[PDB]
């Protein structure tokens, strides 16, 4: 495996996450269902969890995109619970350094999940565990 090809793969996934989020948010703005993150989260999560790509994905700022997928939609509603659960599980597996957290600010959305009274017991627990992990580490 060629590290130029790894980088291509990482940048490709970053663009794909960006494009899906944009289309979801535009649909939401126009009062239409968002379905793109829902349709693609399981496949994209499998790639985000590739051990061979993780250093590169983090290097290429992928936490920006993960954060966006977790953030409220333009109408202030939260993304579908399937995304919430799955991306928290992805983040748990990543060797995330202090610097990645600082530049992405993914900690802020994850912390909100950890204190959101309307969140499911299970997702809120996962978000609490990630906050604790990222505190423990930092």
């Amino acid at each position: 495996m060629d590290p130029g090809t790894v980088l291509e793969i990482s940048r490709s996934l970053k663009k794909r996450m960006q494009d899906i989020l944009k289309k979801d948010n535009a649909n939401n703005l126009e009062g239409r269902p968002a379905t793109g993150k829902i349709e693609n989260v399981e496949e994209i999560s499998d790639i985000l969890m590739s051990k061979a790509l993780q250093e590169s994905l983090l290097d290429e700022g992928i936490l920006d995109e993960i954060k966006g997928w977790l953030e409220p939609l333009p109408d202030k509603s939260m993304p579908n619970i399937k995304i919430r659960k799955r991306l928290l599980d992805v983040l748990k597996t990543m060797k995330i350094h202090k610097e990645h957290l600082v530049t992405s600010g993914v900690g802020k959305i994850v912390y909100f999940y950890s204190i959101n009274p309307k969140e499911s017991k299970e997702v809120r627990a996962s978000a609490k565990a990630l906050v604790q992990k990222w505190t423990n580490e930092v």
Partner: peptide, 20 residues
């Protein structure tokens, strides 16, 4: 500014979702 604030903010960034 402390590292905790750089990472987690003030913890009010998304409170507008609840107030909605």
């Amino acid at each position: 500014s402390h590292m905790f604030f750089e990472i987690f903010g003030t913890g009010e960034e998304y409170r507008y979702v609840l107030e909605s």
